Symmetry: C2
């Protein structure tokens, strides 16, 4: 389940950054 | 992992919307 979990983690980080911008 | 995959799709849609905006 490493792949899906890391994909979701990266998506959450990118969403955070995009919302800040 | 079906819930994981649909959450991944939700995050993909969210990031797409954020990039467009």
């Amino acid at each position: 389940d490493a792949e899906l979990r890391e994909r979701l983690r990266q998506c959450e980080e990118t969403i955070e950054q995009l919302r800040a911008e």
